[PDB]
Design a protein around this ligand. Structure first.
Ligand SMILES: C[C@@H](C(=O)O)c1cccc(C(=O)c2ccccc2)c1
Ligand SMILES: C[C@H](C(=O)O)c1cccc(C(=O)c2ccccc2)c1
Ligand SMILES: C[C@H](C(=O)O)c1cccc(C(=O)c2ccccc2)c1
Ligand SMILES: C[C@H](C(=O)O)c1cccc(C(=O)c2ccccc2)c1
Ligand SMILES: CCCCCCCCCCCCCC(=O)O
Ligand SMILES: CCCCCCCCCCCCCC(=O)O
Ligand SMILES: CCCCCCCCCCCCCC(=O)O
Length: 583
């Protein structure tokens, strides 16, 4: 191209362009105010428009990296606000861009982003939609500088949709706040997913990843040949290693290039890519990424044939180990989209260990003949846990289910901070909600996607502030063994209970006027501190206090003098518990 700027602007459109440039600048220049970014974006946009007009005009032939970096280094407060980031401006590309990526603050020192009241948001949205949406895009972007800018642009659009629908509704808060809660929880899941994926690559390496991708891609495109899968596994690895390096343009290009190839070769991959591959560039890769599983081939044999009975089983494993175990994952995974990727890796790891031992032994077939008998319990364990948890989730509600997990987990690892025990337990209720409503097939995949995010975030938090050597064990295990380890954690016997604190169990009239979430988290917080104070307390003894307290609030939130009711009946109820259980 004569101008990289012009072509990108033309490709994206003025809106998407202005939006992405705003996210880009906000992720580097995290401490600068919104107005300063809008100034930069307007300047970079006018420059693009002049190049679109005259592609042979001044500076238009420069690389996007050079132009962005040059504009980054115009910023007056650069050395003032970041001392050794102004030292990046002394460097040529691509050392300068590398320098800029290495000076992004993973956690900036910015105040908690507060959600205004529904009426304030809806008025701001009505009165000035663009400023309200763009300021909050900037506020999120600067707090998550490694969040993939296009993905963040998609959330911004889904947020715009929620407001457009609900700010004209009869009951606005009832329409909007559930949607904003969902999008906040999907947004967090996305950032956590990006972190996990890249942390996993950096740690376990390209080989470990290739095993994951084979499994995943084989489930998604079962009608594709092992060759075509392997080819995509290779490309996707390049796409993944870049992106995880953190450059927006390289990552965007690589995802764009792969999406083009996938769409030009649909017939050799999948039939569900049709509509995805009619969508625009930015949406193309995202659509493909979130595309339905293709129907598995009608006529498929049993793996037993080529992976046990075949003459050349041990010959094939000898010739090329990784490729053969690669074929094993491919054949098993494509027959089982109902399986978690980690489950498939356990079967592959188990099959590997079997071939290692047996192909040495005198009669190989005799040895690994019953290899599938070892796969039965590995498959059955997660299938049981999911059904056992979805039964309980339905018998109770999400809330009462969260409370069940809360007691279960507090008793297992009570050294974890209350807010962590609460948020983890709450999040696993949300996993219960989403995944148990999916049909039996899509359940284990669903559970994996969210558990991976929940467990990794807990482990990240644990890395910072460690408490239990058993959480450190599960967190330092292989990703394949991480969930079963956590599942395996037993009730803590050695733990000495927490000292009683009067204020921890002191409740006020405010609890009556709090939103459902605010109320739930306060009650759940106390339920943890109760279990921490009395871990030997029986299932009967816990629901007794939980029922007694439920009657306490429901009575005292109907009283004419509510604050006095909570003071009076509160010290009464707490005292009755100190008798029922102990001080
Ligand atoms: C609703 C659902 C989702 O994402 O659709 C979900 C499932 C599990 C956890 C979370 C979540 O909120 C989370 C995000 C980041 C760190 C920890 C937990 C959200
Ligand atoms: C995440 C935060 C919340 O839920 O407290 C929030 C509250 C209200 C509005 C917005 C947005 O407009 C927005 C803009 C761009 C991307 C994502 C969201 C975000
Ligand atoms: C709202 C809060 C903050 O920004 O302080 C927060 C905490 C964690 C993750 C995220 C996100 O990445 C995100 C992205 C898009 C929409 C919603 C959330 C946001
Ligand atoms: C999947 C597994 C389960 O549901 O069996 C699970 C998921 C989340 C957490 C835990 C914990 O043991 C735990 C307990 C206390 C603090 C932190 C983690 C276990
Ligand atoms: C809770 C969800 C994770 C938020 C932690 C901060 C993330 C900062 C880096 C951005 C990203 O990786 O997407
Ligand atoms: C069904 C939703 C609630 C989830 C509760 C935890 C149960 C364990 C899930 C097992 C599947 C995870 C993937 C795996 O370990 O193979
Ligand atoms: C000294 C103990 C004081 C009371 C402890 C607080 C109990 C928390 C109850 C959590 C659940 C209440 C709601 C419900 O079960 O319907």
């Amino acid at each position: 191209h004569k101008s990289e700027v012009a072509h990108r602007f033309k490709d994206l459109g003025e809106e998407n362009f202005k939006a992405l440039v705003l996210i880009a600048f906000a992720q580097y220049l995290q401490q600068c105010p919104f107005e300063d970014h809008v100034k930069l974006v307007n300047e970079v946009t006018e420059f693009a428009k002049t190049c679109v007009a005259d592609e042979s005009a001044e500076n238009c032939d420069k690389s996007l990296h050079t132009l962005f970096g040059d504009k980054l280094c115009t910023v007056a407060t650069l050395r003032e606000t970041y001392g050794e980031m102004a030292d990046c401006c002394a460097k040529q590309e691509p050392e300068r861009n590398e320098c800029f990526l290495q000076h992004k603050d993973d956690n900036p020192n910015l105040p908690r982003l507060v959600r205004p009241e529904v009426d304030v948001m809806c008025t701001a949205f009505h009165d000035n939609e663009e400023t309200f949406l763009k300021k909050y895009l900037y506020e999120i972007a600067r707090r998550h500088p490694y969040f993939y800018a296009p993905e963040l642009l998609f959330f911004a659009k889904r947020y715009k949709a929620a407001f457009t629908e609900c700010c004209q509704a009869a009951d606005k808060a009832a329409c909007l706040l559930p949607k904003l809660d969902e999008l906040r929880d999907e947004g967090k899941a996305s950032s956590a997913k990006q972190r996990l994926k890249c942390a996993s690559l950096q740690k376990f390496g390209e080989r470990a990843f290739k095993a994951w991708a084979v499994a995943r891609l084989s489930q998604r495109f079962p009608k594709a040949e092992f060759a075509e899968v392997s080819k995509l596994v290779t490309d996707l690895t390049k796409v993944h290693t870049e992106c995880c390096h953190g450059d927006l343009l390289e990552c965007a290009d690589d995802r764009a290039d792969l999406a083009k190839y996938i769409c030009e070769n649909q017939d050799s991959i999948s039939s569900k890519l049709k509509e995805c591959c009619e969508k625009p560039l930015l949406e193309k890769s995202h659509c493909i990424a979130e595309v339905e599983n293709d129907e598995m081939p009608a006529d498929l044999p049993s793996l037993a044939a080529d992976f046990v009975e075949s003459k050349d089983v041990c010959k094939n494993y000898a010739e090329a180990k990784d490729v053969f175990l690669g074929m094993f994952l491919y054949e098993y995974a494509r027959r089982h989209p109902d399986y978690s990727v980690v489950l498939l890796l356990r079967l592959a790891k188990t099959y590997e260990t079997t071939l290692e031992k047996c192909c040495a032994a005198a009669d190989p077939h005799e040895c690994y003949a019953k290899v599938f008998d070892e796969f039965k319990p590995l498959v059955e364990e997660p299938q049981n846990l999911i059904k056992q948890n979805c039964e309980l989730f339905e018998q109770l509600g999400e809330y009462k289910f969260q409370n069940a997990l809360l007691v279960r987990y507090t008793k297992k690892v009570p050294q974890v901070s209350t807010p962590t025990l609460v948020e983890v337990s709450r999040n696993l209720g949300k996993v219960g909600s989403k995944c148990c409503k999916h049909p039996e097939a899509k359940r284990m995949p669903c559970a994996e996607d969210y558990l991976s995010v929940v467990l990794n975030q807990l482990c990240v938090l644990h890395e910072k502030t460690p408490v239990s050597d058993r959480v450190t064990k599960c967190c330092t295990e292989s990703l394949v063994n991480r969930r079963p380890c956590f599942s395996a954690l037993e009730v803590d016997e050695t733990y000495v209970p927490k000292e009683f604190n009067a204020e921890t169990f002191t409740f006020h009239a405010d609890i009556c006027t709090l939103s459902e979430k605010e109320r739930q988290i306060k009650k759940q917080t106390a339920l943890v501190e109760l279990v921490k104070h009395k871990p030997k307390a029986t299932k009967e003894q816990l629901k007794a206090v939980m029922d007694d307290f439920a009657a306490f609030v429901e009575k005292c939130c109907k009283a004419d003098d509510k604050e006095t009711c909570f003071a009076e009946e509160g010290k009464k109820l707490v005292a009755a518990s100190q008798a029922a259980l102990g001080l």
